[PDB]
């Protein structure tokens, strides 16, 4: 049980329920919502609100009085406050609407007076004149003050204050100078945070919520002898027959109205078999500005829950300003009927704008798929509509996949369909794929490339299609160096012997290649020679060569009769969480771009890299490939469809250098291998804008990235460290909760000395870094020096910002 | 002679004039404006538009058809185009309003078709569907195409195209595929730039300009038997007597209406002695939606310019939809009467909100002062109202100063009043002024400070109160170093001998001081020992010391019986245009902050520095004192009242280092001493938001600063150089045009090899720097090596970014 409500005898949206059954569409063009879904949308910051109050007698908090809502974030908290109130500074029109608190300067500490609905020099006498404070009605409390404030303990019982609204009329009641007498009994420490001003007005009549939602009318049942309007608020699942109206009237479900004569602003009451069958309400000279139920004609009555007739009642109803509360399952049946054809008309919307239900939230993915009979082969069909937003096309195909996996049947084929659609989604699409006869080298030379290695301070999986979806992200990361060499360095050379040898080190015997076979493209054997395969995907076709005539390929290209032999080197395993695979591939491509020709750009290097990273079939951790190639920023992932990829600009480091020296940084612990990653990129691509609060948390990762760059763009190194630890929290506790408790033992000690950290990139193995004050940092090096030392060793490794990172072709 | 106009028989704001006499208030709350003042506001980008067309037969361009206006900047030009059209992409409501051009992809090159007022699948058949283009009607032309396009040469004469509007109906006419036949005769090269979408709608009725201006009603003549409204458009200088109305009607001047019965949307015609005297128009059953003049009663006639009556005409006027153009000095008298009491009611507004006329533009400063009898002793009085915006207070005091200087009388006292008010304006105001007994040193030590030297790449005199005014600026500058030492370095020491010796080098014998006398504070003898005087202005008072008891000051403070002896060093004269004075002072204060105590911050160092820079009485070139102390950015001057001063955040340099090496920078020529500056800071502080297009150009200096930081925040070094040369243009050709032609000979050669430059800071002496491609740069060093070498030598000096810049107190 929670907030039951007040009397609130103004709004016609008060069918005899609580506050959960007046369904209203979303701002992103879906009709599956009300306060109840919006109450959930506010409950998520409200269940976020809990921190360090009590054990099980803490709270599960009573909801508000619903000044409307969903502007920016609460907290609105310090963990030693009983109560934190809300402040709002707007034009004094909303002062004249509802009550404003005001006190001494400074006001948001401890209230001294107020004025409910202020007008002129009275409002000026709210000294100081501009210390306004408008609450909206969700407060914390201590473990004590329940027994005084709301439900005051008397000798009879713990009776409420006789104000039925506890919150608003207590703040009206106790908000004056009796607070300076009264709140000193129950732990006087109180702070107040005010609020911004987005979507804050009230729920007076239906036009309030209409103006909030800007527009109306979605099911849409259009029977006949009706009247076309727009402004009128019809929600879902109301069969609208045979009645002529003017707008402002709202009609839910368990309501099949036929042949009436109605005007503006209509409550229409449910819970009953209401037709023009047995209620006998046909010749209905219905007045204006009143609330059904029963009022066939007359002037300005008051009849509540369904009083019964046949026809006789049509006479004494011009007796105005009288009160007859017409009352002393079928509403749940209204809800059940309303939720019956919801997925049906969602399929209709998946026909209508064909993503208006699908790629708007798809939020009820599993319950949409299973319940009730939603056949997502229609989603496969409209996925293959012609071609769409392949976003939306693949979204529908993945809805089909989500059904076929989720119901029972062909999850592997559902995954295959989603995989191929995912590829096809990224198959778009680039210049050219070309034909170019590379030449340069020339013979005697050796081309050696090299590259530093990113980490990502913040701006985490705002990369990785599905992004937001499209669009964009932003990461701002860095691009730094392990002590020397950068590492990740690639050598590539001509030879004599027309078989393209891929040659690796730390693993590599060789890869003798000329077949292609396809080309290259191999997720076939994951000898990371796989990555140079794709490095031959320059295009890697052309006229007019052939399979034997790699002879022609080389031996007109290079011409330099190589069968080129290309020899990489990574220093670190791919269990880094440093994107080393991606960076490595990119670096090879830069070497090719030098190597025999084709003349490209850093950016389009990374473009074509990402392009082949598609067919590399790893989830495109893509932040890195701009990161570790370039220098210490990234920033701005922006467009992400389909997939467009700028993202650039810069930042000073400079507090990673000129160095801080308030440490003067951060540095390394593996003791932990990776798992490696086989669930992580799943949770990424499960899903797109399908699910869930993922998408939510993703969005403020982006926000926190802009937080990051502004922070260190000012140089708040101490706050840089805060935001680092925040990002850690923002992924550890968030997606993805995989960080394996040995990591947490390395966190455990220390956590202390001084400040935060993160795992870069992947998480679940690899290695951290962390910032401290200053040489206590070196004593932390002494700490990890002391213990916690498996043979994955436990080092200072630095990191070492040092960067440009490219190639030589020397000499 | 210019744009006379079209027929345009819709808008009631068409009293028989051109387009200059329907006065409308400004967005910044003054009523002294119309298109004519707004035509000037558009004329300034229009006279900006001229570049490289012709000699004296170039143009002085015909004005537009007035889709309304004053969104963002034109150009909208390449200097080889005949005609550049305007593009606009909005909702197709304004497509249904007025004509849209559309062509192939890409559209903004050479037009192929159009559709005037498009509707549905017709508008979709503007292939490609979203290639819209809405012109607003000011084009260039070649030196040729006058004789074809507008006023086509025939055998009779050079007759116009029979379209009376040349522009709009020619673009309707020639904008189709007949352009692909026709515009190939007259230098076919044409490009098009589209536009943004701020304030673009039309002038259909009065509500259009009302919605544009959002609000109405300023003179305000309120006679009796009238009706209170708001929405009605009454401009200035209309005595409104004895008539009852509904809104939407507009009334100018030479109009003293009494006792009529009028409704909405009224043209009211001038040029005549119109009272209820001799026109005899009293019993006036005036209809709705028609245009005075003459219509006493009736239904929907058409009577133009003043047809004459007595009473008899009141009968055959229900003869609707008839045309009787009532026509086949006193309007200039209306303008003269309207401009008579304008300064009177400006004084009333200078009483009303007391800056609503004053510190809103004060734009007509000299003509406001002189014409006609505006006595600005009222501006002195309301300057001393109590205390105000001392912005507005000092603005009014300076309006008084502007009058007293400008009329004749007491310019020096007017300057004195403005000077004292300027001080008093900056006298506000800081913590504390304190009392602190500094202690630290200790004895044996020597405290040595040091500092690098700013230049300002862009973001020029957006510093320097008056800023915008208040608020703010932004400069982003750098903070760099001459080869070594930083210079500007200060030594300060205890001694034995209780007389505070200021000791300088390159000039300094000594300054033996203990008197104070005041304290310190000396614009008295400009031995730059003056600057250390203010450096003793710590506060520089306290309890409970006295004049002899600097004995107490020192000899309890330090205690260390010094009479402290403080010894600076500048390397460069104050004729640098590098703010060296200000930086120097600040550095001393940092040394004091170390020196004997008081424990401050960089920022509040600079705060208190600026505070004393007030009493230093130089115009506060203030950018520098944050600049050259800190490192290579500044950025964000923001608040500038009263005067608030954050301003911080950062940027990478990084293309001033890791160096470019596409030169890998810029460096020095004096051959020129300064004048020095005695007119420059005048033109700054002449004026505040008084005058002129200064304020305009100032604003886009700020814009160009954000341009700057974004540019090099991405690393567009080539465009960095563009924006440098732009800033040069933006001050040389702009405020202030003082750069003395020897400088321009050093510009002359080179200008060339490759790119631009500026004088930092002051200008009019000192030394530049300039960027080139790369080693052609060194050949420029060879160029200045070759010639142009006075004994103010002609060097490479670098610059040398190298920076933190503070102090030692070693050991």
In the numeric block, which tokens belong to residue A520? 């290259």
Contacts of A654 in chain B (CB under 8 A): 631, 650, 652
Pull the structure tokens for residue B558: 């330090």
CA nearest A802 in B: which residue? B658
HEC assignment per residue over A279-290: CCCCCCECCCCC
Give the whole-angstrom CA distance, residue B448 versus residue B590: 10
Separation of CA A609 from chain center: 27
With 0-12 CB in 10 A as exposed, 13-18 as middle and 19+ as buried, what is B601? exposed
Q: Which of B631, B649, B653 sits opposite A713 (nearest CB)?
A: B649
Residues 6+ apart with CB under 8 A from A541: A433, A435, A519
Rg value, chain B, Cα: 33
Contacts of B646 in chain A (CB under 8 A): none
Residue B503 to residues A154, A589, B496, B527, Cα–Cα distance (Å): 81, 64, 16, 11
E strand or H helix that includes residue A603? helix A602-616
Q: Do A772 and A780 contact (CB within 8 A), yes or no?
A: yes
Length of chain B in terms of residues written: 811
> Do B463 and B622 touch, CB atoms closer than 8 A?
yes
Q: For residues B331 and B253, what is the distance between their CA atoms, to the nearest angstrom? A: 8
**Residue B699 tokens, joined:** 């604003």
Distance CA A641, CA A389 (A): 9
Residue A714: closest CA among chain B residues belongs to which residue?
B649
Q: Angle at CA A310, nearest 5°, toward A307 and A316?
A: 70
Instruction: Please answer yes or no on whether B654 and A633 come within 8 Å at the CB atom.
Output: no
- Please, what's the largest Cα pairwise distance for chain A? 109
* Token pair listed for B142: 């070649």
Q: Are A613 and A567 in contact (CB under 8 A)?
A: no
Rounded to whole angstroms, the Cα distance separating A379 from A399 reads 6
Q: At what angle do helices B580-595 and B602-616 cross, to 10 degrees?
A: 130
SS3 per residue for B669-700:
CCCECCCCCCCHHHHHHCCCCCCCHHHHHHHH
Buried b (16+ CB within 10 A) or exposed e, B28-54: eebbbbbbbebbebbbeebeebeeebe
Query: Which of B340, B291, B286 has the alpha carbon at shortest distance from B318?
Result: B286
Q: Which residues pair with B480 in a beta bridge?
A: B453
Cβ atoms within 10 A of the Cβ of B747, count? 20
**Prior bond to A801 cis, omega within 30?**
no
Yes or no, beta carbons of B713 and A649 under 8 Å apart: yes
Nearest-CA distance from A651 to chain B in Å? 5
Three-class secondary structure of residue A13 per DSSP = coil
What is the C-alpha to C-alpha distance for residues B483 and A552, in angstroms, rounded to an integer?
58
| Sign of the alpha-carbon torsion through B253, B255, B257, B262 | negative
Asked if A652 lies within 8 A of B651 by C-beta distance, the reply is yes
- Distance from the Cα of A463 to chain B's closest Cα (Å) equals 20
E strand or H helix at B747 = helix B741-748
Burial of A320 (0-12, 13-18, 19+ CB in 10 A): exposed
Q: What's phi and psi for B418, nearest 5 deg?
A: -65, -35
**Dihedral sign for Cα atoms in the order A221, A226, A228, A232:** negative
Residue A131 CA, distance from chain mean position: 35
Rounded Cα gap, residues A213 and A231, in angstroms: 11
**Residue (of B430, B438, B442) closest to B545 by Cα position:** B438
Q: Which residue has the tokens 């009979």?
A: A373
CB atoms under 10 Å from CB of A227, counted, come to 12
CA distance B264 to B108: 43
Sign of the CA dihedral with A410 first, then A415, A416, and A420 last: positive
Residues of A in contact with B804 (CB under 8 A): 658
The 10 Å Cβ neighbour count of residue B708 is: 26
Q: Considering only the beta carbons, identify the residue of A649, A652, A710 that sits closest to B714.
A: A649
CB contact under 8 A, B650 and A652: yes
Q: CA of B654: which chain A residue's CA is closest?
A: A652
Which candidate in B633, B635, B654 is best for mutational testing of the A interface (most A CBs within 10 A)?
A: B654
Pairing label, strands B158-160, B193-194: unpaired
Interface test with A, best of B710, B713, B716, B717 (most A CBs within 10 A): B713
Beta carbons within 8 Å of B162's beta carbon, 6+ residues apart: none
The span from the CA of B552 to the CA of A712, in Å, is 46
CB A198 within 8 A of CB A71: yes
Give the gap in angstroms from C-alpha B713 to the nearest C-alpha of chain A: 5
Q: CA of A806, closest CA in chain B: separation in Å?
A: 14
Judge: B652–A653 Cβ closer than 8 Å, yes or no. Answer: yes
The answer to whether A64 and A397 have CB atoms below 8 angstroms apart is no
Q: How many residues are given for chain A?
A: 811
User: Contact, A539 vs A557, CB < 8 A?
Assistant: no
CA distance B356 to B25: 12
Q: Which residue in A has a C-alpha nearest to residue B648's C-alpha?
A: A714
CA–CA gap between residue A691 and residue B142 (Å, rounded): 60
What's the CA dihedral at A741, A745, A750, A756 to 10 degrees? -10
The whole-angstrom separation of Cα B481 and Cα B475 is 19
Looking at the DSSP bridge assignments, the partners of residue A672 are A766
Q: Is A650 in contact with B710 (Cβ distance < 8 A)? A: no
Contacts of A713 in chain B (CB under 8 A): 649-651
CA–CA distance, A102 with A159 (Å, rounded to integer)? 29
Q: Which two tokens stand for residue B332?
A: 């200039």
Q: Which residue has the tokens 């019993």?
A: B283
Could you report how far apart the first and last alpha carbons of chain B are, in Å? 78
CB A455 within 8 A of CB A539: no
Cis peptide before A644 (omega within 30 of 0): no
Listed residue (B699, B645, B691) closest to B398, CA to CA: B691
Burial of B484 (0-12, 13-18, 19+ CB in 10 A): exposed
Contact call for A649 and B710, based on CB within 8 A: yes
Please give the Cα distance from A261 to A281 (Å, whole number). Answer: 11
**In this structure, what token pair is assigned to residue A467?**
């992004």
DSSP-derived secondary structure for A93-138: HHHHHS-EEE-SSS-TTS--EEESS--HHHHHTSSSTT--B---S-
Closest CA to B803 of B593, B666, B656: B656
Cα A512–Cα A515–Cα A519 angle in degrees, nearest 5:
105
Indicate which of A602, A713, A719 best probes the interface with B, i.e. most B CBs within 10 Å of its own CB: A713
Instruction: Name which of B484, B499, B487 is nearest B566 in CA terms.
Output: B499
Angle B182-B187-B188 from CA coordinates, rounded to 5°: 55
Which pairing describes strands A86-87 and A500-503: parallel, antiparallel, or unpaired? Answer: unpaired
Q: Are B667 and B758 in contact (CB under 8 A)?
A: no
DSSP single-letter state for residue A368 = H
Residue with tokens 């450096």: B535
The closest of B355, B460, B330, B509 to B30, measured between CA atoms, is B355
Nearest chain A residue to B802 by CA: give it.
A658
Among chain B, residues having any CB pair with chain A shorter than 8 Å are 631, 633, 648-654, 658, 710, 713-715, 804
Radius of gyration (C-alpha) of chain A in whole angstroms: 33
Name the one residue in this structure whose structure tokens are 């390929």. Answer: A553
Contact A13, A209 (CB under 8 A): yes
A633 to chain B: which residues are within 8 Å by CB?
652
**B714/A653 CB distance under 8 A:** no
Q: Residue A773 has which token pair? A: 């004050």
Residue B713 has its nearest CB partner, among A650, A654, A714, at: A650
Min Cα separation B708/chain A (Å): 13
Q: Are the beta carbons of A714 and B651 separated by less than 8 Å? A: no
**What is the 8-class DSSP label of residue A588?**
H
Name the residue with tokens 């563009």: B722
Class of residue A77 by CB neighbours under 10 A (exposed 0-12, middle 13-18, buried 19+): middle
**Of residues B692, B756, B752, the one with CA closest to residue B727:** B756
Question: How far is it, in rounded angstroms, from Cα B198 to Cα B212?
Answer: 11
**E-assigned strand segments in B408-509:** 447-449, 490-493, 500-503
Whether cis (ω within 30° of 0) applies to the bond prior to A485 is: yes
In B, minimum Cα distance to A631 occurs at: B654
- A contact test, residue of B652, B714, B716 with most A CBs within 10 A: B652
Say yes or no for a CB contact (<8 Å) between A652 and B654: yes
Q: Give Cα A11 to chain centroid, integer Å.
A: 33
For B444, counting Cβ atoms within 10 Å of its Cβ (0-12 exposed, 13-18 middle, 19+ buried), the class is exposed
Residues of B in contact with A661 (CB under 8 A): none
Determine which helix (DSSP H) or strand (DSSP E) holds A336, and give its type and residue range: helix A330-340
Instruction: Give CA–CA dist B458/B476, Å, rounded.
Output: 7
β-strands A490-493, A447-449: how paired? antiparallel
Token reading at B656: 């001033």
Residues 6+ apart with CB under 8 A from A28: A360, A361
Query: For testing the chain B interface, which of A630, A647, A714, A805 should be mutated: the one with the most B CBs within 10 Å?
Result: A714
Whole-number Å distance between alpha carbons of A257 and A270:
11
Of B631, B650, B652, the CB nearest to A714: B650
Q: Which residue of A has its CA nearest to B653?
A: A652
DSSP B408-423: STTHHHHHHHHHHHHH
Give B-chain residues touching A631 at CB under 8 angstroms: 654, 658
Q: Within 10 Å of residue B171's Cβ, how many Cβ atoms?
A: 25
Q: Where are the beta strands (DSSP E) in A340-486?
A: 447-449
Planar angle of CA B721, B725, B728, nearest 5 degrees: 145
Note whether A701 and A730 are within 8 A (CB). yes
| Spatial separation of the C-alpha atoms in residues A128 and A136, rounded to whole Å | 22
Among the listed residues B794, B796, B781, B803, the one whose alpha carbon sits nearest the alpha carbon of residue B656: B803
Tokens of B48: 């900006």
Question: Which of A596, A587, A606 shows the shortest CA–CA distance to A487?
Answer: A587
Interface of A with B (CB under 8 A): 631, 633, 648-654, 658, 710, 713-715, 804
Q: Would the CA dihedral through A565, A571, A577, A579 be positive or negative?
A: negative
The answer to whether B421 and B394 are in contact (CB under 8 A) is yes
Q: Among B648, B652, B713, whose Cβ lies nearest the Cβ of A654?
A: B652
The verdict on a CB contact (< 8 Å) between B710 and A633 is no
Which residue among A648, A658, A713 places its CB closest to the CB of B804? A658
Give the span between the Cα atoms of A100 and A85, in whole angstroms: 12
Coil/strand/helix, residue A440: coil
Backbone angles phi, psi at A567, to 5 degrees: -140, 105
Residue of A nearest to B716 (CA): A649
For residues B635 and B649, the answer to whether their CB atoms sit within 8 Å is yes
Q: Which of B650, B652, B710 sits opposite A715 (nearest CB)?
A: B650
Torsion (CA) A551, A556, A562, A568 in degrees, nearest 10: -110
CA distance to partner chain B, nearest, from residue A652 (Å): 4
In units of Å, what resolution does this entry have?
4.2
**How far is it, in rounded angstroms, from Cα B540 to Cα B436?**
9
Residues with Cβ within 8 Å of B23's Cβ and at least 6 positions away in sequence, in order, are: B31, B32, B33, B34, B235, B236, B252, B338
Other beta carbons within 10 Å of B326: 15
Q: Which residues pair with A87 in a beta bridge?
A: A194
User: Rounded CA gap, A586 and A625, in Å?
Assistant: 7
Cis before residue B62, ω within 30 degrees of 0? Answer: no
Cα dihedral sign, B642-B645-B646-B651: positive
Tell me the C-alpha to C-alpha distance, in Å, between residue B272 and each of A667, B237, B249, B295, B332. 88, 16, 19, 16, 11
Give the side-chain half-sphere CA count within 13 A for B679.
9
How many of the other CB atoms lie within 10 Å of CB of A456?
A: 28
Nearest 10 degrees: CA dihedral of B231, B234, B239, B240? -30
Closest approach of A710 to chain B, Cα-based (Å)? 8
Angstroms from A332 CA to nearest CA on chain B? 43
Long-range pairs of B211-216 with CB within 8 A, sequence gap ≥ 24: B212/B68, B213/B24, B213/B25, B213/B27
Closest listed residue to residue A580, CA positions, set A720, A730, A767: A767
How big is the A-B interface in CB pairs under 8 Å?
39
Chain B interface mutation, best of A478, A652, A707, highest count of B Cβ atoms under 10 Å: A652
Q: Which residues contact A384 (CB under 8 A, 6 or more apart)?
A: A393, A397
Phi–psi pair at A133, nearest 5 degrees: -160, 110
**CA-to-CA distance for B70 and A664, rounded, in angstroms?**
52
């Amino acid at each position: 049980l929670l907030h039951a409500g007040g009397q609130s005898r103004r709004l016609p949206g008060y069918a005899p329920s609580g506050k959960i059954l007046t369904p209203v569409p979303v701002f992103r063009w879906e009709r599956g919502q009300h306060l109840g879904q919006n109450l959930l949308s506010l409950q998520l910051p409200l269940y976020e609100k809990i921190m360090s109050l009590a054990p099980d007698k803490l709270h599960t908090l009573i909801a508000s009085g619903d000044v409307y809502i969903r502007s920016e974030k609460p907290l609105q908290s310090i963990p030693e406050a009983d109560v934190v109130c809300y402040g709002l500074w707007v034009d004094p029109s909303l002062a004249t609407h509802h009550g404003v608190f005001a006190s001494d300067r400074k006001h948001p500490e401890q209230l001294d007076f107020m004025l409910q609905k202020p007008s002129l020099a009275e409002l000026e006498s709210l000294s100081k004149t501009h210390l306004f404070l408008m609450d909206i009605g969700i407060w914390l409390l201590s473990d004590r003050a329940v027994e005084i404030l709301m439900k005051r303990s008397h000798k009879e019982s713990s009776e409420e204050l006789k104000y039925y609204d506890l919150y608003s009329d207590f703040g009206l009641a106790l908000g004056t100078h009796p607070r300076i007498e009264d709140e000193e009994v129950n732990t006087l420490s109180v702070a107040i945070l005010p609020l911004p001003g987005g979507e804050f007005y009230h729920y007076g009549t239906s036009k309030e919520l209409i103006s909030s939602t800007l527009s109306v009318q979605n099911k849409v049942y259009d029977q006949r002898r009706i009247m076309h309007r727009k402004v009128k608020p019809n929600p879902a699942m109301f069969v609208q027959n045979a009645v002529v109206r003017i707008p402002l009237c709202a009609e839910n479900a368990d309501l099949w109205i036929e042949n009436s004569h109605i005007g503006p602003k209509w409550k229409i009451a449910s819970r009953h078999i209401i037709t023009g069958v047995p209620e006998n309400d046909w010749s209905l000279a219905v007045p204006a500005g009143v609330c059904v139920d029963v009022v066939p004609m007359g002037d300005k009555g008051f009849v509540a829950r369904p009083y019964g007739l046949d026809d006789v009642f049509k006479g004494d109803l011009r007796d105005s300003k009288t009160t007859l509360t017409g009352i002393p399952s079928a509403g749940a049946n209204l809800k059940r009927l309303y939720a019956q054809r919801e997925e049906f008309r969602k399929g209709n919307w998946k026909a209508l704008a064909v993503n208006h239900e699908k790629s708007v939230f798809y939020q009820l993915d599993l319950a949409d798929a299973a319940e009730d009979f939603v056949r997502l082969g229609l989603d496969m069909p409209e996925l293959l509509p012609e071609d769409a937003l392949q976003m939306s096309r693949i979204h529908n195909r993945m809805l089909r996949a989500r059904i076929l996996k989720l119901d029972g049947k062909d999850y592997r084929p559902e995954e295959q369909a989603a995989f191929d659609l995912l590829r096809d989604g990224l198959l778009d699409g680039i210049s050219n794929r070309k034909s170019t006869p590379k030449l340069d080298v020339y013979s005697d030379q050796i081309v050696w490339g090299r590259s530093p290695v990113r980490i990502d301070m913040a701006g985490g999986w705002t990369d990785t299609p599905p992004y937001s979806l499209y669009s964009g992200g932003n990461v701002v990361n860095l691009a730094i160096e392990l002590n020397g060499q950068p590492p990740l360095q690639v050598y590539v050379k001509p030879c004599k012997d027309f078989h393209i040898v891929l040659r690796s080190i730390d693993m590599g015997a060789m890869e003798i290649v000329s077949t292609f076979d396809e080309l290259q493209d191999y997720k076939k054997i994951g000898s990371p020679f796989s990555i140079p395969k794709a490095a031959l995907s320059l295009a890697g076709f052309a006229p007019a060569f052939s399979a034997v005539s790699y002879a022609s390929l080389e031996e007109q290209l290079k011409d330099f009769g190589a069968g080129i032999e290309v020899t990489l080197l990574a220093a670190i395993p791919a269990g880094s969480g440093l994107g080393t695979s991606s960076i490595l591939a990119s670096t090879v491509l830069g070497a090719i771009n030098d190597f025999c020709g084709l003349a490209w750009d850093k950016n389009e290097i990374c473009q074509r890299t990402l392009v082949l990273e598609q067919l590399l079939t790893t989830g495109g951790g893509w932040q890195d490939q701009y990161g570790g190639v370039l220098q210490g920023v990234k920033l701005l992932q922006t467009e992400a469809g389909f997939a467009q990829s700028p993202l650039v600009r810069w930042l000073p480091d400079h507090l990673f250098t000129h160095p801080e020296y308030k440490d003067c940084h951060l540095l390394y612990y593996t003791g932990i291998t990776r798992t490696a990653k086989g669930i992580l990129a799943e949770i990424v691509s499960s899903m797109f804008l399908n699910s869930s609060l993922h998408l939510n948390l993703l969005s403020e990762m982006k926000a926190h990235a802009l937080d990051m760059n502004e922070a260190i763009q000012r140089g708040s190194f101490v706050e840089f460290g805060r935001l680092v630890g925040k990002t850690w929290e923002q992924n550890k506790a968030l997606d993805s909760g995989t960080n394996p408790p040995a990591v947490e033992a390395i966190i455990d000690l220390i956590k202390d000395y001084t400040l935060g950290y993160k795992l870069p990139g992947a998480g679940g193995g690899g290695y951290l870094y962390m910032v401290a004050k200053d040489p206590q940092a070196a004593v932390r090096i002494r700490k990890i020096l002391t213990e916690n030392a498996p043979n994955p060793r436990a080092r200072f490794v630095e990191m070492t910002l040092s960067d440009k990172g490219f190639q030589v072709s020397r000499s």
